[PDB]
Ligand binder design. Structure first.
Ligand SMILES: CCCCCCCCCCC(CCCCCCCCCC)(CO[C@H]1O[C@@H](CO)[C@H](O[C@@H]2O[C@@H](CO)[C@H](O)[C@@H](O)[C@@H]2O)[C@@H](O)[C@@H]1O)CO[C@H]1O[C@@H](CO)[C@H](O[C@@H]2O[C@@H](CO)[C@H](O)[C@@H](O)[C@@H]2O)[C@@H](O)[C@H]1O
Ligand SMILES: CCCCC/C=C/C/C=C/C/C=C\C/C=C\CCCC(=O)O[C@H](COC(=O)CCCCCCCCCCCCCCCCC)COP(=O)(O)O[C@@H]1[C@H](O)[C@H](O)[C@@H](O)[C@H](O)[C@H]1O
Ligand SMILES: CCCCC/C=C/C/C=C/C/C=C\C/C=C\CCCC(=O)O[C@H](COC(=O)CCCCCCCCCCCCCCCCC)COP(=O)(O)O[C@@H]1[C@H](O)[C@H](O)[C@@H](O)[C@H](O)[C@H]1O
Ligand SMILES: CCCCC/C=C/C/C=C\CCCCCCCC(=O)O[C@H](COC(=O)CCCCCCCCCCCCCCC)COP(=O)([O-])OCC[N+](C)(C)C
Ligand SMILES: CCCCCCCCCCCCCCCCCC(=O)OC[C@H](COP(=O)(O)OCCN)OC(=O)CCCCCCCCCCCCCCCCC
Ligand SMILES: CCCCCCCCCCCCCCCCCC(=O)OC[C@H](COP(=O)(O)OCCN)OC(=O)CCCCCCCCCCCCCCCCC
Ligand SMILES: CCCCCCCCCCCCCCCCCC(=O)OC[C@H](COP(=O)(O)OCCN)OC(=O)CCCCCCCCCCCCCCCCC
Ligand SMILES: CCCCCCCCCCCCCCCCCC(=O)OC[C@H](COP(=O)(O)OCCN)OC(=O)CCCCCCCCCCCCCCCCC
Lengths: 89, 469, 56, 182, 69, 172, 481
């Protein structure tokens, strides 16, 4: 199981392509991890609902609210937006 | 070498009989080849873009003019081969293509005139070389005096060339009257800022450019090209264009000229649009030449045009020679010879050529798609370099017009291939006759250059960076 | 002449043309050789021998 | 494999010469000439040269064989089409059930189809190193790394524990990669 | 067992080398473009020997005082 | 933007067009009092094209208080309307109008010049990668642009936000 | 090797006389070679892998290991690998579909076909703008010649259309490529997202690139050349053109446009959505009143490409994945329909007018089954890759713009209308009086159609099997801050 070392666009000189590729890949992989977190949430919600039936509302309120919260933020967003813009300035 | 050749050739052609014409021309063909190969090493003089003024500041020698010179020799070699060798050994072709007695001397003298135009550093040398080329080319037009059209052509050419020469001499003398000088080298940025030479320099440029037939003064040249013998047209349509354009590129006297901009636009439009309704082969090719002269005129509006211009002129010379040679070869398969000076005249006379000679049509396709500019043929890279230059210098509207003109001219370029890949009822069954080995090899060499030149692009640019920087 | 005979049938070129040929070929050769030597003089090709001989 | 024999072609050529053109060779639809057409057409499927001779021999034999095979092709297929009879067995029988192999089938069936099968297999098995599996493993390893005591819990309790920890905390590193943001 | 891809690090190294060659070409390209627009010496651009731009006119009626620097 | 004097410029254009049509008529005569009889209305062609183009161009430029290709588009539309009225057919009139307007709008977009504006061209402009924190000019390139410039030019929404999402949604 | 293989080619030509067996063998070897490459392709990396360079100055005729790179660049990532696999799948079928109906100058015909296939395959390997453009135009001479010599009655006009329209678009593409070259002095695809042009310059370059995309995809309103060129092309030309050359456009968006002109693309996206909704609705409606078989099949492709475009500019991972899957599924299905209409029906009856055809089920039940299956696949039945592509593309489009995507959901209905209206008349009714009974579909035709059907079904039931090559790509191009 590979765990490549994380790199950020902010530190690097964009003229070393190896580092830039590593930054792009690291950003993508973190997005995918965030997706896995969202899916874990959703699977827990499904199990909660299926076992709680009529009182699933009270039993699963926390999971439902959290899943609805992480939906707009835990998708893919791609690295071009952040490498091509520096948020400081 | 060229002067020595001219002198010797005058002596021999005086003392030789009319049957020795082709042997003499073969002799000069080989002599020019020998000079090209043995004296090529003089390129080394031009390392680091070293410029030399020679003959008391009358002639200028740099890498650019050396290259133009070599190109002109290559063209002369190819053109002289067409006269020095018979396509076929039958009676018909002895009648069709026989070299006149003095033709070779006229060819060499016109070449000398062109080389002196290229190298000219002073206006007196420019004018003398222009007049030398103009006179020799009048005579080449007129040497086939059995043709009514050729004599009419030579006379019209004499008069139009005379008027343009008077415009040129007037421009030279106005420049003298304002600056008391005959050299452009005396010009500087300070002088151009201080004085308004625009009118004089543009008159000189226009007087030179109307001699290669840019719009709106095209039609007289297209008529001359139409009415001359085909092996004469292969020459007179090419060498003057090269010499005049090369001189103008080297001189750079019309940078960002509004008048040249408008005339280059007009030339593109007329060359593209006007060639559409043509039915005669040579008029189609002359309008092709007009459009390509427009493409090269664009390069007179900017500095650092050496690479794009050299690449374009070389690939254009090769494509032009090749298309004329293909039209020449396709003569053997026509069923009607129109006359002894122009055996084939109408595009439709090629109809079904693919059934008679498949690979001749293959070569035709290759050259046509070079003209249209299909990569990776040479024509594409020529147009690419030109677009690079003009967009780097902010000629946006002219770039759009160049796009449009290439599109339009593709129609009458493909007209040839279209009729050539159609079907003819009477298809060659057999023949004992063999096309001459030498001309077929030359045509093949041109075709292979057009096809596989692009593999040397990066090597060429590397060489260029050390001889022109 | 071998490649593409002037009159269909191979024939060796006449002596007039061959004499011409030698004359002009010598002219081209001498021009080339003069150019090579002059280029040595300018210091464009290798010129150690010529340099020493000139110094002497 | 070498099977050429110039003696046989120089004979086959005039054996063909006697016959009308294959276009008109069967337009009668006597049985004797149709029989000879049957045998000569049968010669088409009797393969008569292998690789050792096409590689080694000269091109005059090549052109002669090529013409012979062209005419054999024509006779075979023209008869087979305007008779509904195969040129094997030797007088024109009707036995069309089987013994028919087109030329494309060997190449296609024995190379192209195995190639597509191989492509499908490779895609199915390359689908295993998917980023979803990698990220599930990475998330599990991040939980185990930060919190190694669930390494003491029994197997069935583990996965529920990892899920608990994932739900509670943001084990990702994305914000850590976004250092200029804060 | 039949999958033998190249290592990830080797792929990154090879692509980085290619990109480095590409950037070298970009720099040489911009360099040549700048050098072509710089101005050469009179000897290199006009005449190596006889490198004096200053003329000397005619020599018949050479008048004392006509010379001006 | 300070106004074009529409009336005056149009009057000078009327004069120029009349003279040009006169020259074309004289030529036409020489190449073929009858010169205007056998003119083909070329004097009217020139005069009408001149007045239409200049008047519409100045009018549009003054009304919009801008100078750009759109004014040339309108002026080409007017010129095409004039030239296509000669056909006396509605489809041809509309075609001349729209196509001449399009061609002249393209011309005005590229700079309304046949030669080049040398100072603005790439060869005469600052190019290449910019220095430390300088403002981007038209021909220059960077490795990263300022996010505020993105938000102002492109506009908020559709995934364009002032702050990266993950940063903004971080818990403490 | 090359010398020996050339000797083999020459000898096979001299003895057999028809190159076509050699070409079939060659193309199958190429397919096997690409599969070997896929085996050895690392998917846990977003870097180009099988790199090589040609025409470098230090080695014009070989590969370059120099420290200066002035030649043409080639290499592949997952996105290129997908389309390359599609290409090598399609080429042998293109050779095979004309195995018997070409009886004159056949060697030249097969040479042109194989050359076009190889040109497209190489085009997918290109890694910089100039080589991409070179191989992007190199097909036009071959297509022109092929259509002119081996086309149907109206083939001259077809050839002139296919050359002229594509040149017209390609030259504006050339303007954009020249601007990029002179502004950046680089052309590569490896690091071209690192260069951030000024917004105005991006907006200008985007125009030339997108004009090329409009002509090549095609999109409304400049789509009128495609139905012609298809109807008068021979079968190989039509199959190649429908199955690969159109996907070259989608690959062009993803490779040339999105990484470089991100902000300008964000600015221009609603214009793209206008043009795509136009092409979908209007071409789907115009298909209803056509009377030629091949013309109708040609009109179907334009609408499916419109849905593909709506997917690919959606700025969402789902939209891009849907566009790719739809491209692949279309490359499977459309060649099959073209096979039917222009190789089975056209080779049996030599006519394409719809009025002549009716009730083909009675004599040719197998052909009727194939028509039904292929038509329900073309209109987007689930468990077919076409449905997955259209569904994901529509999801992305609806997210990017809810109104426009919601309206675009009418494509399902419109596609059903034209396709089923065709197949209704073709399959049923009483057998036509104008035509006579002919053979049913043969073993070769059935083989080709089975290949295409199983491919589209396989990716339709489990579209995930493509993800291992595309999971980097679905993030490499979306622009979210
Ligand atoms: C694929 C379809 C092709 C069709 C579209 C092509 C048309 C190109 C139009 C775009 C463009 C050339 C761009 C070329 C880029 C590559 C070319 C593309 C391929 C070429 C085929 C022509 O811009 C023209 O637009 C016309 C209006 O339409 C104007 O018309 C005229 O308006 C009136 C005169 O003032 C008259 O009344 C009349 O004379 C006309 O009315 C012209 O003056 C103007 O030059 C813009 O170029 C210029 O833009 C400006 C600011 O942008 C740049 O300077 C900037 O200065 C600061 C702000 O200024 C910025 O702070 C700074 O950052 C930046 O330094 C310049 O450096 C320059 O670059
Ligand atoms: C054998 C025949 C023998 C016959 C001999 C008798 C004829 C003698 C004279 C005729 C000579 C030949 C005539 C040739 C045609 C004349 C046209 C001509 O030169 O181009 C014009 C003349 O620009 C005048 O400003 C010049 C303006 C023209 C003068 C005014 C008109 C007077 C008529 C009054 C009524 C040259 O500007 P140009 O292109 O550089 O234009 C621009 C612009 O001028 C500059 O601002 C820019 O900086 C520069 O970059 C450039 O782009
Ligand atoms: C960088 C660009 C610069 C230059 C590139 C251009 C050309 C390449 C350079 C050099 C080209 C030199 C090539 C010499 C070798 C070429 C060569 O096989 O002989 C000739 C052509 O020979 C030239 O016609 C020789 C004419 C030379 C002119 C070529 C220039 C174009 C072709 O043989 P071939 O079997 O047909 O010749 C046979 C045989 O010789 C006779 O005995 C037979 O009786 C007769 O039937 C004939 O067919
Ligand atoms: C044994 C001696 C034989 C030499 C005879 C030469 C004859 C010239 C005849 C016709 C011109 C034809 C093509 C010229 C090639 C340019 C050389 C050069 O590199 O161009 C550069 C300058 O690049 C330029 O501006 C652009 C040139 C545009 C070329 C357009 C065509 C490109 C494709 C041609 C591919 C070459 C074919 C090779 C096949 C194996 C000048 O080089 P240079 O001045 O240092 O002289 C070279 C050293 N030399 C004298 C010993 C030979
Ligand atoms: C060249 C190198 C690459 C070629 C690759 C394949 C090599 C083998 C080709 C082949 O199999 O034969 C080609 C064709 C058939 O040979 P054959 O049977 O003898 O012709 C019948 C009449 N003899 O031989 C011929 O019939 C030749 C007929 C030529 C057809 C003329 C028109 C075709 C023009 C092609 C367009 C090229 C345009 C180039 C521009 C860019 C293209 C990338
Ligand atoms: C296959 C063949 C394919 C051919 C493709 C079409 C080629 C061209 C056909 C004719 C199109 C003519 C375009 C005329 C446009 C009129 C015009 O004046 O454009 C100027 C306009 C604004 O330019 P600007 O002055 O810079 O104002 C900035 C304000 N934001 O600039 C613009 O904003 C652009 C306006 C037009 C947008 C594109 C039109 C279609 C291309
Ligand atoms: C006419 C149109 C314009 C023409 C412009 C371009 C013309 C190019 C002519 C075709 C030549 C390209 C194909 C051969 C080049 C690749 C040869 C090679 O060796 O691959 C290099 C690459 C790296 O190999 P290496 O670094 O040496 O390490 C080996 C480790 N054992 O090893 C690899 O990774 C394998 C690479 C596989 C490449 C697949 C190519 C697909 C098609 C192959 C034939 C295409 C011929 C096209 C003909 C029509 C013209 C386009
Ligand atoms: C319109 C039509 C346009 C046509 C465009 C096609 C252009 C074709 C140009 C061919 C050059 C590209 C060849 C691809 C390179 C493949 C290769 O490597 O070939 C082997 C050899 C050099 O190999 P090497 O450099 O040693 O690298 C291998 C290390 N493992 O390579 C060689 O030794 C050279 C052999 C190729 C000779 C080709 C000559 C022209 C063809 C006639």
């Amino acid at each position: 199981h590979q765990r490549p070392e994380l790199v950020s666009f902010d530190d690097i000189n964009y003229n070393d392509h190896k580092k830039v590729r590593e930054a792009q890949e690291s950003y993508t992989r973190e997005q995918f991890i965030r997706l896995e977190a969202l899916k874990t949430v959703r699977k827990a919600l499904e199990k909660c609902y299926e076992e709680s039936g009529p009182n699933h509302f009270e039993d699963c309120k926390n999971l439902a609210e959290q899943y609805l919260d992480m939906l707009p933020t835990h998708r893919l967003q791609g690295y071009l937006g952040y490498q091509r813009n520096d948020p400081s300035k | 070498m060229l002067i020595l050749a001219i002198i010797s050739l005058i002596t021999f052609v005086s003392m030789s009989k009319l049957s020795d014409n082709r042997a003499i021309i073969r002799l000069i063909n080989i002599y020019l080849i020998l000079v090209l190969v043995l004296d090529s090493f003089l390129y080394l003089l031009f390392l680091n873009n070293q410029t030399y003024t020679v003959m008391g500041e009358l002639l200028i020698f740099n890498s650019f003019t050396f290259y133009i010179d070599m190109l002109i020799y290559f063209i002369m070699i190819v053109i002289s081969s067409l006269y020095g060798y018979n396509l076929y050994n039958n009676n018909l072709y002895k009648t069709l293509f026989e070299p006149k007695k003095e033709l070779i001397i006229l060819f060499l003298i016109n070449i000398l005139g062109a080389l002196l135009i290229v190298h000219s550093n002073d206006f007196i040398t420019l004018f003398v070389a222009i007049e030398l080329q103009s006179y020799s080319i009048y005579l080449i037009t007129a040497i086939y005096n059995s043709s009514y059209k050729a004599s009419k052509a030579s006379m019209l050419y004499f008069f139009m060339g005379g008027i343009l020469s008077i415009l040129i001499a007037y421009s030279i003398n106005t420049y003298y009257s304002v600056l008391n000088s005959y050299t452009l080298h005396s010009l500087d940025s300070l002088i151009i800022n201080t004085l308004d030479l625009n009118l004089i320099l543009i008159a000189l440029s226009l007087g030179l450019l109307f001699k290669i037939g840019i719009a709106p003064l095209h039609k007289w040249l297209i008529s001359i090209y139409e009415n001359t013998p085909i092996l004469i047209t292969i020459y007179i349509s090419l060498i003057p264009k090269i010499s005049i354009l090369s001189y103008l590129v080297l001189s750079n006297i019309s940078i960002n000229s509004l008048v040249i901009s408008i005339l280059a636009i007009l030339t593109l439009l007329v060359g593209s649009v006007g060639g559409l309704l043509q039915i005669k082969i040579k008029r189609l090719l002359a309008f092709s030449g007009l459009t390509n002269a427009g493409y090269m005129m664009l390069l007179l509006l900017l500095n650092n045009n050496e690479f794009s211009y050299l690449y374009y002129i070389t690939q254009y010379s090769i494509s032009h020679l090749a298309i004329f040679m293909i039209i020449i070869f396709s003569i053997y398969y026509i069923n009607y010879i129109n006359n002894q000076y122009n055996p084939i005249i109408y595009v439709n006379q090629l109809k079904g050529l693919i059934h008679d000679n498949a690979y001749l049509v293959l070569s035709m396709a290759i050259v046509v798609f070079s003209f249209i500019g299909i990569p990776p043929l040479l024509g594409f890279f020529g147009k690419l370099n030109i677009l690079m230059s003009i967009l780097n210098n902010g000629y946006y509207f002219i770039s759009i017009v160049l796009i449009v003109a290439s599109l339009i001219s593709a129609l009458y370029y493909l007209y040839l291939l279209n009729v050539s890949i159609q079907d003819k009822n009477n298809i060659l069954i057999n023949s004992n006759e063999t096309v001459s080995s030498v001309l077929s090899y030359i045509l093949s060499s041109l075709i292979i250059l057009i096809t596989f030149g692009f593999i040397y692009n990066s090597l060429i640019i590397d060489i260029f960076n050390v001889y022109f920087n | 002449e071998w490649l593409d005979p002037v009159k269909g049938k191979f024939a060796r070129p006449s002596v007039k043309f061959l004499r011409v040929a030698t004359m002009l070929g010598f002219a081209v050769g001498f021009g080339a050789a003069y150019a090579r030597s002059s280029l040595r003089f300018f210091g464009v090709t290798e010129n150690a021998r010529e340099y020493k001989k000139d110094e002497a | 494999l070498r099977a050429y024999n110039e003696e046989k072609e120089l004979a086959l050529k005039q054996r063909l010469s006697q016959l009308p053109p294959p276009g008109k060779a069967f337009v009668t639809a006597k049985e004797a000439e149709l029989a000879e057409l049957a045998e000569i057409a049968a010669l088409y499927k009797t393969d008569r040269v292998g690789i050792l001779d096409i590689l080694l021999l000269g091109n005059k034999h090549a052109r002669l064989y090529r013409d012979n095979t062209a005419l054999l092709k024509d006779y075979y297929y023209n008869g087979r089409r305007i008779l509904d009879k195969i040129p094997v067995k030797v007088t024109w029988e009707i036995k069309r059930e089987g013994a028919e192999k087109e030329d494309w089938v060997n190449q296609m069936y024995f190379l192209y189809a195995p190639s597509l099968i191989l492509l499908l297999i490779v895609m199915v098995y390359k689908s295993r190193e998917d980023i979803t599996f990698w990220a599930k493993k990475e998330l599990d390893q991040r939980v185990l790394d930060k919190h190694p005591e669930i390494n003491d819990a029994p197997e069935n309790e583990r996965d529920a524990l990892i899920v608990e920890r994932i739900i509670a905390g943001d084990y990702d590193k994305l914000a850590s990669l976004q250092k200029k943001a804060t | 067992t039949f999958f033998h891809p190249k290592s990830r690090e080797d792929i990154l190294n090879e692509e980085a080398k290619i990109v480095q060659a590409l950037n070298n070409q970009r720099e040489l390209t911009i360099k040549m473009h700048e050098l072509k627009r710089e101005e050469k010496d009179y000897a290199h651009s006009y005449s190596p020997l006889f490198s004096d731009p200053v003329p000397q006119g005619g020599s018949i009626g050479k008048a004392p005082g006509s010379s001006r620097e | 933007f300070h106004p074009y004097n529409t009336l005056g410029l149009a009057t000078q254009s009327a004069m120029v067009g009349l003279g040009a049509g006169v020259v074309a008529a004289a030529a036409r005569n020489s190449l073929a009092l009858t010169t205007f009889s056998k003119s083909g209305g070329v004097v009217t062609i020139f005069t009408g094209a001149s007045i239409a183009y200049v008047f519409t161009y100045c009018s549009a430029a003054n009304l919009r208080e801008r100078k750009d290709g759109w004014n040339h588009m309108w002026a080409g539309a007017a010129t095409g309307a004039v030239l296509g009225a000669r056909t006396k057919l509605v489809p041809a009139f509309i075609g001349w109008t729209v196509l001449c307007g399009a061609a002249c709008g393209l011309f005005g977009w590229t700079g309304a010049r046949f030669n080049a504006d040398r100072k603005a061209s790439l060869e005469q402009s600052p190019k290449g990668f910019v220095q430390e924190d300088a403002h981007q000019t038209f021909w220059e390139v960077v490795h990263r642009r300022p996010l505020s410039l993105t938000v102002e030019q492109l506009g908020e929404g559709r995934g364009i936000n002032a702050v990266p999402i993950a940063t903004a949604t971080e818990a403490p | 090797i090359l010398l020996s293989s050339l000797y083999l080619f020459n000898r096979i030509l001299a003895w057999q006389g028809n190159v076509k067996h050699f070409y079939l063998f060659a193309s199958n070897l190429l397919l096997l070679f690409i599969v070997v490459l896929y085996i050895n392709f690392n998917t846990f990396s977003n870097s180009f892998q099988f790199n090589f360079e040609l025409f470098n100055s230090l080695n014009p005729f070989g590969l370059s290991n120099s420290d200066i790179s002035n030649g043409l660049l080639f290499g592949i990532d997952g996105l290129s690998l997908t389309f390359i696999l599609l290409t090598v799948l399609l080429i042998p079928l293109t050779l095979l579909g004309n195995w018997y109906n070409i009886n004159f100058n056949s060697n030249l015909y097969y040479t042109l076909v194989l050359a076009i296939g190889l040109v497209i395959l190489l085009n997918f390997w290109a890694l910089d703008y100039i080589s991409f453009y070179i191989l992007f135009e190199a097909t036009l001479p071959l297509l022109f010649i092929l259509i002119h010599i081996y086309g149907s009655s109206d083939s001259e006009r077809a050839s002139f259309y296919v050359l002229m329209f594509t040149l017209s678009g390609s030259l504006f593409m050339l303007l954009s490529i020249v601007v990029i070259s002179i502004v950046l002095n680089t052309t590569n695809f490896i690091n071209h997202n690192l260069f951030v042009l000024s917004l105005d310059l991006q907006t200008i370059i985007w125009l030339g690139l997108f004009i090329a995309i409009m002509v090549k995809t095609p999109l409304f309103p400049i789509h009128v050349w495609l139905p012609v060129v298809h109807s008068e092309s021979p079968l190989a030309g039509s199959m190649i053109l429908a199955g690969l050359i159109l996907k070259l456009a989608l690959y062009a968006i993803l490779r040339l446009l999105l990484p470089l002109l991100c902000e300008a693309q964000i600015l221009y996206t609603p214009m793209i959505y206008i043009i795509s909704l136009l092409t979908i609705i209007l071409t789907s409606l115009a298909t209803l009143r056509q009377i030629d078989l091949k013309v109708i099949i040609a009109y179907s492709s334009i609408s499916h490409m419109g849905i593909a475009i709506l997917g690919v500019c959606s700025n969402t991972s789902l939209g891009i994945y849907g566009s790719i899957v739809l491209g692949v599924a279309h490359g499977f299905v459309s060649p099959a329909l073209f096979l039917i209409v222009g190789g089975i029906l056209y080779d049996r009856y030599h006519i394409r007018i719809v009025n002549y055809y009716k009730g083909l089920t009675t004599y040719m039940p197998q052909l009727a089954t194939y028509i039904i299956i292929l038509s329900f696949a073309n209109i987007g039945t689930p468990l077919t890759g076409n449905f997955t592509g259209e569904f994901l593309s529509l999801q992305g489009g609806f997210i990017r713009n809810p109104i426009i995507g919601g309206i675009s959901c009418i494509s399902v209905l419109l596609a059903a209308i034209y396709q089923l209206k065709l197949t209704n008349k073709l399959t049923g009714g009483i057998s036509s009086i104008y035509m006579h009974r002919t053979n049913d579909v043969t073993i070769r035709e059935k083989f080709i159609m089975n290949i295409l059907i199983i491919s589209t079904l396989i990716i339709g039931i489990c579209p995930q099997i493509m993800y291992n090559l595309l999971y980097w790509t679905v993030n490499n191009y979306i622009y979210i801050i």
